[PDB]
Design a protein around this ligand. Structure first.
Ligand SMILES: CCCCCCCCCCCCCCCCCC(=O)OC[C@H](COP(=O)([O-])OCC(O)COP(=O)([O-])OC[C@@H](COC(=O)CCCCCCCCCCCCCCCCC)OC(=O)CCCCCCCCCCCCCCCCC)OC(=O)CCCCCCCCCCCCCCCCC
Ligand SMILES: CCCCCCCCCCCCCCCCCC(=O)OC[C@H](COP(=O)([O-])OCC(O)COP(=O)([O-])OC[C@@H](COC(=O)CCCCCCCCCCCCCCCCC)OC(=O)CCCCCCCCCCCCCCCCC)OC(=O)CCCCCCCCCCCCCCCCC
Ligand SMILES: CCCCCCCCCCCCCCCCCC(=O)OC[C@H](COP(=O)([O-])OCC(O)COP(=O)([O-])OC[C@@H](COC(=O)CCCCCCCCCCCCCCCCC)OC(=O)CCCCCCCCCCCCCCCCC)OC(=O)CCCCCCCCCCCCCCCCC
Ligand SMILES: CCCCCCCCCCCCCCCC(=O)O[C@H](COC(=O)CCCCCCC[C@@H](C)CCCCCCCCC)COP(=O)(O)O[C@H]1[C@H](O)[C@H](O)[C@@H](O)[C@@H](O)[C@@H]1O
Ligand SMILES: CCCCCCCC/C=C\CCCCCCCC(=O)OC[C@H](COP(=O)(O)OCCN)OC(=O)CCCCCCCCCCCCCCC
Ligand SMILES: CC(C)=CCC/C(C)=C/CC/C(C)=C/CC/C(C)=C/CC/C(C)=C/CC/C(C)=C/CC/C(C)=C/CC1=C(C)C(=O)c2ccccc2C1=O
Ligand code: HEC
Ligand code: HEC
Ligand code: HEM
Ligand code: HEM
Ligand code: FES
Lengths: 53, 223, 185, 531, 74, 139, 51
């Protein structure tokens, strides 16, 4: 994450300490049907899965 | 260069200040700051013709360039010197390297493209749609330096591929694979846009099935 | 025959409107001829006036044959009309092929639509005229099929007459455009 | 020389098997000549192509999920680690002469098989041929449709490439895994474990080359046996009745027509397999769980399913410690659809109470409710199909992805209702047009101004006049153009450039006119006598 | 459920659907459009589109029901 | 039919006068010589009216007076047959849909959609033109 | 029927995957699951090439 946007980060309960500064790590497996949700839009910080959008 | 920097500034002050603030800090709700983007970002934005923009929307589309190669170089020098950041790979004669950027390993470039790039355009870079009005464009009509600087400076909703995330040899392999996929003719016949089963089904319904039904109507009878 | 034929008058007025469309194209051409400065056409353009004359002559011959086919169809002879219109179709096809060949040779010599303003106007005007020629060829094919599918009534003769009207308008427009491009320059 | 051989062979055959009565019965069978009755035959002929090319493809395909390095001729994949199935598919496309052609003809034949099954289903549904006694034949057809869909799915899943592997992972793994009680058990029975296993491709290969083709072959055999011994339906017409079949005998008109249609369909499939590229696997690369592509769509006969999964709005349930995901909906969806397709004749039989023997087809305009339902279902299917392709539509036609998603979501409700309304009104309006023609006569397009100024159109009555006596609708099409009743005359006979002598023109035109009168007279006598 | 004057070819095939099926179909379609407002989306333009289409459907059903209840429409 | 012709060459006379006046007044007293866009359009407007008027004049030179061109005419003079007017057709909507497919394919620059629209246009125009000329089916 | 289908029936919850907390089912584990209670698991990029 760009630091100018790190104030916008909302953290999940029980995962408040999973990032190392600006670097977050998520699964690359969609929670819907298991396709690789592998489209990272940086200016919206949106992870997109092409199998079902 | 004093002449080069002055020409870059005199181009920038009549093409970019209304959105970029005339001191390269962004205009609040027109454009972002231009400190640190560098010659590579300027080259990819202008030589593609995306920039100057005209409307604030989901995505600024590619257009014919608004300047020439020398003017793009002057603007890149201006923005680089006022800030500082990545540069375009140059050639032995002062221009930007085009054939030199074409890598050797095309299988590795293909693997890297499919891991990093094909997720947003497609297998062969034919383009793909994004969330809200945005999309990843077709890569066919883009020379190697544009590909390299698009990897190097992710413009908008493109992840930024630094020189250590994607090394220059990796970047050249990806450039080589992209150019090879753009320039390769289809072997099975007419490539139906390179998108897969959707144009195939449309062709079957509009050519094969139409011809089959017409032949049935010719052979059979009405009433 | 104490009344006028309305398919003919409708074709005539529509052909006048198409003349107006080519007027727009001519206005596009004449402008940027006065802005070049006299270097018209500019290099690397060198008009191939050795293939442009033959296709012009073939178009004039096709107009003559089309009028002869009209003469055939005015007396109810469907077969002579078919023959003259097939000859006209073949010669118009030859004209289109020659235009395409000149296009190819010009594009090979660095004269393109994005390449120059002269290229832009030249290919725009000539290509639109070629599209009109291709429409005329489609009209010829459709008319021949319709003559094949029913007894040759005076309605068929009217259809042939108006198709010939369109063909005459097309080659007259080509005569004007040839005189404007390869002679006035 | 061949007449004696034919006579001796016939004598030997009759002395050994005495088939004369049965062969004569099969040669005299009468088949109606409507063009739509050819639609099913397309699904037959493509299937035969699918057998032939299929056998060819079995001589070069190794369906192993074992991983190897390519070292083939295709440079842009040299040294890439891939499964053995993907490598053998590449070898077919590049190392076997005509292998790419056979692959493409096979895939095109699969697409035409699916499409022609759909069009034949539309014909059967709208003409009402599913009615008694032909309900079981509709059931068999529906089973064949489902089997063909899944057979094609398995087929293009056979070469383990990125697109097909992504489709496998999405549908066959994700949907199966999420089923309420037995989902993981089904997944581990099918895959032998987790999705990226080692047995999936051989199992699908066995299912796809032997099991499903065998089931489809048996079902097509039973299907055609039912069609043969339950003689074909027909549309109401001049000589037609519920107790007869009017058409042509098998020998030789029907046999030659069917053979020529087979040859022409094979020609179309060969031309498409040569000139059009389908499934260029080498551009997709080997399947890798870490990679995916933007254009992730199955072959079109499955597209609707994905569209459903794209449009259903993230509705999940959480019972006591358990999760019911969104994919479950999709499964139920498909189930319901298939159910609603299999038991339609019985649903309509219950609803309308119509349980009478029917051999005369219905024109779709004469059944506005069923036509409206069929148009509604077609609209919904098309909408789901296009919602599957909404990423490509968004890319090519400038529209946002969320816009297409919400258009699809609202449409899967609004559009079927509009289409039902429009189809119902359109069918009744076609009925009204038929009645208008029957009651005033055909409008000839000729306008006369009477001496007092009356602009009248010349009507050509189809029956006697008293103004015509209004005829009664008999379920048959009516002419509405005068060129279709012969008013357009005949052109001068010749070679399109040169006429024949007028004596030959007179002889041919008079002979044709006499033959047309003789045919119409024969039909009229048969109609009059039987009724 | 129809007459030859309304559907000319009524004797030939299924030609009537009870108006109850259409009325409850409209109500259920409106309910589905409304219930699609519960889910995962930041924006609220789609909610207004759903509300507008549901309003149109409910208005059509209400008008049809009212006119059949008063006698004009049959 | 003298009136329609006469109106067309009246328009032709005025348009020719205006075109020549514009050409002369732009050749001298303009910034950059002849304007070359109004002049061209005015000259070819003159040509449009000239073609229509000339054809109508050739028709009037070859025509005895019709009822509608004849004052003191009686309806009974116009009695008889008028000709063929199409009673109904659904081909125009198909032609328009085909041209719209082509227009969309050339607005969003998609050559495949342009080709599909062009093929659909040829097919629907064939259907329109052939509609009243297709014979009875052979069977 | 039982002796036919029974060869395909596999328990998805049979513990087969080692873990720093014993044996666990496949669906509960991935390659990120530590295996000896202090295992250093690196986030490695795919170079797409030996190593
Ligand atoms: C890019 C994707 C899109 C492109 C299209 C995809 C591919 C198209 C497939 C076309 C294949 C159609 C069948 C091919 C076999 C040829 C059949 C044949 O030879 O019989 C003549 C056949 C009539 O046979 P018939 O059985 O006696 O007709 C019975 C009635 O009298 C008939 O009376 P009717 O009034 O009921 O018939 C109405 C209908 C007649 O057509 C039909 O009824 C059959 C439906 C086919 C219509 C065309 C649709 C194709 C595009 C959609 O009239 C039309 O619609 C005219 C359309 C003609 C278009 C041709 C130009 C296309 C070229 C594109 C460039 O004529 C046609 O139907 C159309 C001819 C066009 C085929 C081109 C090659 C044959 C030329 C014949 C020369 C003599
Ligand atoms: C922006 C650019 C624009 C360009 C375009 C340019 C176009 C210009 C636009 C402007 C045009 C201005 C007007 C043009 C002229 C139109 C006027 C005219 O000619 O006729 C006079 C026209 C005649 O209308 P009317 O006097 O009311 O009489 C109606 C008829 O008599 C009807 O007689 P009926 O009683 O037999 O009606 C039958 C039934 C209509 O029947 C239907 O429509 C139902 C459709 C489906 C049937 C059910 C499904 C089939 C069964 C299968 C399943 C079994 C279970 O009635 C209804 O139920 C209506 C409500 C519809 C509710 C159905 C909605 C959902 C259906 C359920 C399907 C669910 C989908 C399942 C898919 C699976 C999903 C998971 O008079 C008017 O002008 C009325 C104005 C309209 C009222 C609007 C007031 C609402 C407030 C504003 C909106
Ligand atoms: C874009 C599409 C449109 C959307 C925009 C619409 C803008 C909204 C404007 C609303 C118009 C209000 C003025 C009419 C008041 C209607 C009541 C009335 O007239 O009572 C007389 C009526 C007289 O009694 P009667 O003697 O038995 O009637 C026999 C006569 O023949 C009675 O004569 P009739 O049977 O021949 O029908 C007359 C009467 C009775 O019919 C009805 O039942 C009307 C019921 C609904 C009408 C609309 C009100 C609700 C609209 C919702 C808001 C939409 C936005 O009302 C109408 O049908 C007129 C509606 C259509 C007029 C224009 C039609 C075509 C021109 C459009 C131009 C081109 C199209 C583009 C659109 C441009 C629009 C400017 O008394 C009634 O009780 C009828 C009402 C039936 C009530 C049943 C429940 C209806 C469901 C409505 C609830 C909507 C929910 C609210 C939305 C909440 C969300 C925020
Ligand atoms: C059955 C007829 C088929 C004839 C086949 C028989 C020909 C014999 C040999 C065939 C050899 C193959 C032909 C040339 C070999 C070849 O493939 O040429 C492509 C060209 O494709 C195009 O667009 C050109 C479009 C013009 C074709 C028009 C015909 C299409 C018909 C079949 C569609 C009708 C169905 C309509 C559907 C909708 C109708 C319903 C509404 C490359 O275009 P390119 O300029 O490089 O750009 C691409 C971009 O995807 C991108 O820009 C990318 O960047 C590039 O990499 C390249 O892929
Ligand atoms: C619209 C106006 C149409 C005019 C017809 C004239 C066509 C004549 C062809 C001109 C030849 C030419 O100029 O080719 C040179 C340039 C290449 O530039 P290049 O790269 O430097 O050269 C190459 C180096 N490899 O062609 C081009 O830009 C592409 C031109 C392609 C013309 C496509 C025709 C459009 C059809 C319009 C249909 C209208 C339907 C709408 C319905 C309402
Ligand atoms: C879902 C939705 C609302 C979409 C709207 C987008 C759109 C088409 C807007 C057009 C503007 C509008 C609404 C005009 C209305 C006036 C009318 C009635 C126009 C009719 C003409 C229309 C709508 C044409 C569109 C047809 C259409 C959307 C087809 C589906 C697109 C498909 C299947 C493309 C498949 C396909 C692709 C993607 C290729 O790349 C390719 C490359 C080479 C050969 C073939 C192909 C090929 O077939
Ligand atoms: C308002 C219409 C602008 C004009 C005038 C110029 N730029 Fe721009 N720029 C604008 C926006 C809204 C954005 C970001 C969103 C987008 O669509 O790109 C940009 C971005 C750039 C960048 C890239 C910044 C990055 O971090 O990658 C560069 C290098 C850039 N702009 C340069 C640039 C130049 C050289 C201009 C004159 C030709 C110019 N901009 C004008 C908005 C606007
Ligand atoms: C997220 C989706 C991605 C990823 C992972 C990649 N690209 Fe692409 N790309 C994306 C967008 C939204 C854009 C638009 C640029 C803008 O609007 O300013 C692009 C653009 C390109 C381009 C320029 C194309 C042109 O203008 O002609 C290229 C050459 C390109 N992208 C290539 C590319 C490569 C090589 C990638 C892997 C390193 C890659 N992209 C990934 C979206 C996305
Ligand atoms: C592989 C799939 C299929 C094949 C090979 C096939 C083939 C055929 C053929 C050749 C006919 C006779 C000619 C004709 O009616 O067109 C026929 C008839 C029929 N089919 Fe199909 N069809 C298939 C799918 C279906 C489907 C999906 C349905 C629903 C269906 C229901 C019927 C019925 C009811 C008939 C009887 C038609 C009548 O009696 O008029 N079949 N089938
Ligand atoms: C209704 C019947 C069938 C359908 C719909 C069907 C469909 C398909 C499809 C679409 C493919 C993808 C091919 C590609 O993308 O390259 C495929 C592959 C294959 N098919 Fe079929 N098929 C059918 C029957 C058969 C039969 C009967 C056989 C064998 C006799 C067969 C053998 C194969 C093989 C071996 C492959 C994989 C090899 C390859 O992909 O090149 N198929 N099938
Ligand atoms: S698998 Fe990611 S949205 Fe379906």
């Amino acid at each position: 994450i760009k630091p100018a946007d790190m104030h916008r980060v909302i953290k999940r309960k029980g995962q408040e300490s999973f990032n190392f500064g600006e670097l977050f790590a998520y699964t690359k497996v969609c929670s819907h049907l298991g396709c690789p949700s592998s489209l990272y839009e940086q200016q919206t910080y949106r992870i997109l899965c092409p199998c079902h959008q | 260069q004093s002449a080069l920097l002055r020409t870059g500034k005199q181009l920038f002050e009549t093409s970019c200040v209304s959105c970029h603030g005339a001191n390269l800090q962004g205009v609040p709700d027109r454009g972002p700051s231009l400190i640190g983007t560098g010659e590579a970002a300027v080259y990819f934005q202008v030589s593609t013709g995306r920039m100057p923009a005209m409307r604030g929307e989901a995505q600024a589309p590619s257009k014919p360039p608004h300047f020439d190669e020398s003017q793009i170089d002057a603007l890149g020098a201006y923005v680089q010197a006022n800030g500082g950041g990545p540069t375009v790979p140059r050639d032995d004669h002062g221009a930007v390297a085009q054939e030199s950027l074409i890598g050797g390993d095309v299988a590795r470039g293909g693997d890297l493209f499919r891991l990093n790039c094909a997720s947003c355009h497609n297998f062969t870079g034919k383009g793909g749609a994004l969330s809200s009005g945005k999309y990843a464009p077709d890569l066919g009509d883009a020379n190697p330096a544009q590909i390299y600087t698009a990897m190097l400076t992710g413009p908008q909703n493109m992840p930024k591929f630094s020189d250590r995330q994607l090394t220059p040899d990796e970047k050249r392999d990806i450039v080589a694979y992209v150019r090879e996929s753009a320039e390769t003719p289809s072997y099975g016949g007419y490539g139906l846009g390179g998108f897969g089963p959707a144009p195939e089904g449309m062709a079957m319904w509009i050519i094969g099935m139409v011809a089959a039904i017409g032949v049935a109507m010719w052979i059979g009878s009405r009433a | 025959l104490n009344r006028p034929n309305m398919v003919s008058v409708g074709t005539i007025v529509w052909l006048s409107s198409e003349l107006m469309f080519f007027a727009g194209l001519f206005a596009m051409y004449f402008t940027a001829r006065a802005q070049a400065g006299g270097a018209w056409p500019p290099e690397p353009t060198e008009l191939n006036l050795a293939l442009a004359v033959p296709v012009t002559l073939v178009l004039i011959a096709s107009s003559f044959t089309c009028q002869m086919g009209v003469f055939a169809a005015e007396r109810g002879d469907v077969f002579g009309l078919r023959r003259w219109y097939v000859i006209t179709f073949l010669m118009g096809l030859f004209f289109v092929l020659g235009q395409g060949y000149e296009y190819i040779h010009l594009v090979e010599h660095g004269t393109t639509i994005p390449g120059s303003a002269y290229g832009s106007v030249f290919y725009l005007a000539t290509g639109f005229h070629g599209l009109h020629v291709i429409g005329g060829l489609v009209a010829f094919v459709l008319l021949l099929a319709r003559t094949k599918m029913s007894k040759f009534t005076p309605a068929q003769a009217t259809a042939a007459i108006v198709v010939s009207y369109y063909w005459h308008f097309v080659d007259i427009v080509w005569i004007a455009l040839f005189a404007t491009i390869y002679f006035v320059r | 020389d061949f007449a004696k051989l034919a006579a001796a062979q016939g004598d030997a055959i009759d002395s050994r098997y005495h088939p004369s009565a049965a062969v004569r019965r099969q040669l005299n069978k009468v088949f109606p000549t409507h063009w739509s009755f050819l639609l099913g035959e397309i699904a037959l002929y493509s299937f035969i192509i699918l057998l032939l090319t299929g056998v060819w493809l079995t001589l070069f395909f190794d369906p192993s999920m074992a991983h190897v390095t390519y070292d083939g001729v295709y440079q842009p994949l040299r040294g890439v680690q891939m499964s053995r199935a993907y490598e053998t598919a590449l070898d077919i496309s590049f190392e076997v002469r005509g292998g790419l052609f056979v692959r493409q003809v096979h895939h095109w034949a699969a697409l035409m098989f699916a499409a022609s099954i759909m069009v034949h289903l539309a014909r059967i549904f709208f003409t009402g041929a599913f009615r008694r006694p032909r309900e079981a034949n509709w059931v068999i057809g529906s089973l064949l449709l489902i089997l063909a869909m899944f057979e094609g799915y398995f087929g293009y899943s056979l070469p383990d490439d990125l697109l097909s592997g992504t489709g496998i992972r999405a549908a066959l793994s994700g949907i199966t895994m999420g089923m309420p009680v037995i989902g993981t058990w089904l997944h581990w029975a099918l895959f032998g474990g987790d999705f990226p296993g080692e047995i999936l491709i051989p199992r699908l290969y066995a299912l796809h080359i032997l099991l499903i083709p065998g089931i489809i072959l048996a079902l097509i055999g039973a299907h055609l046996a039912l069609v043969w011994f339950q003689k074909h339906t027909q549309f109401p017409g001049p000589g037609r009745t519920e107790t007869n079949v009017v058409g042509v005998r098998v020998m030789p008109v029907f046999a030659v027509k069917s053979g020529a249609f087979f040859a022409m369909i094979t020609g179309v499939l060969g031309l498409m397999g040569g000139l059009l590229t389908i499934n260029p696997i080498w551009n997709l690369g080997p399947y890798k769980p870490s990679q995916v592509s933007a254009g992730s769509q199955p072959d079109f006969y499955m597209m609707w399913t994905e569209g459903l999964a794209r449009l259903w709005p993230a509705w999940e349930f959480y019972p006591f410690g358990h999760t019911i995901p969104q994919g479950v909906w999709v499964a139920v969806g498909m189930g319901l659809v298939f159910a609603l397709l299999i038991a339609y004749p019985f649903i309509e039989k219950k609803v309308t109470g119509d349980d009478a023997h029917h051999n005369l087809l219905q024109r779709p305009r004469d059944v506005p409710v069923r036509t409206a339902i069929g148009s509604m279902a077609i609209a919904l299917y098309l909408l789901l199909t296009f919602a599957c392709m909404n990423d490509i539509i968004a890319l090519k036609f400038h529209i946002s992805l969320n816009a297409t998603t919400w258009i699809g979501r609202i449409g899967m409700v609004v559009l079927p209702a509009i289409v039902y309304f429009v189809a119902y009104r359109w069918a009744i309006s076609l009925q009204r047009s038929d009645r208008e023609v029957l009651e005033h006569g055909v409008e000839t397009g000729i306008i006369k101004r009477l001496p007092h100024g009356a602009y009248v159109e010349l009507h050509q009555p189809l029956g006697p006049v008293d103004h015509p006596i209004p005829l009664e609708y008999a379920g048959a099409p009516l002419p509405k153009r005068m060129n279709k009743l012969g008013s357009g005359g005949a052109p001068g006979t010749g070679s399109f450039l040169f006429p024949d002598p007028a004596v030959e023109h007179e002889a041919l035109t008079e002979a044709a006119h006499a033959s047309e009168h003789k045919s119409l007279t024969a039909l009229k006598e048969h109609q009059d006598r039987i009724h | 459920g129809v007459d030859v004057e309304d559907v000319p070819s009524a004797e030939w095939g299924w030609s009537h659907m009870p108006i109850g099926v259409m009325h409850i179909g409209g109500l259920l379609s409106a309910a589905f459009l409304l219930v699609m407002m519960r889910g995962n989306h930041v924006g609220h333009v789609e909610d207004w589109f759903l509300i507008g289409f549901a309003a149109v459907i409910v208005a059509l059903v209400g008008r049809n029901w009212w006119l059949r209840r008063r006698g004009w429409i049959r | 039919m003298h009136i329609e012709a006469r109106l067309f060459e009246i328009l032709t006379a005025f348009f020719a006068l205006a075109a020549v006046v514009y050409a002369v007044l732009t050749a001298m007293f303009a910034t950059g010589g002849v304007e070359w866009a109004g002049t061209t359009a005015l000259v070819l407007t003159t040509g449009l009216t000239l073609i229509t008027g000339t054809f109508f004049r050739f028709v009037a030179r070859r025509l005895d007076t019709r009822p509608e061109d004849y004052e003191d005419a009686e309806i009974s003079d116009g009695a008889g047959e008028l000709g063929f007017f199409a009673p109904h057709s659904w081909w125009p909507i198909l032609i328009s849909l085909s041209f719209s497919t082509a227009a969309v394919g050339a607005a969003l620059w998609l050559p495949w959609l342009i080709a599909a629209g062009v093929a659909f246009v040829i097919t629907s125009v064939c259907g329109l033109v052939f509609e009243y000329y297709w014979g009875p089916e052979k069977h | 029927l039982v002796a036919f289908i029974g060869g395909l029936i596999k328990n998805p919850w049979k513990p087969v995957v080692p873990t720093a907390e014993g044996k666990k089912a496949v669906l509960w584990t991935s390659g990120w699951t530590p295996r000896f209670k202090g295992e250093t698991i690196y986030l490695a990029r795919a170079t797409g090439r030996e190593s």
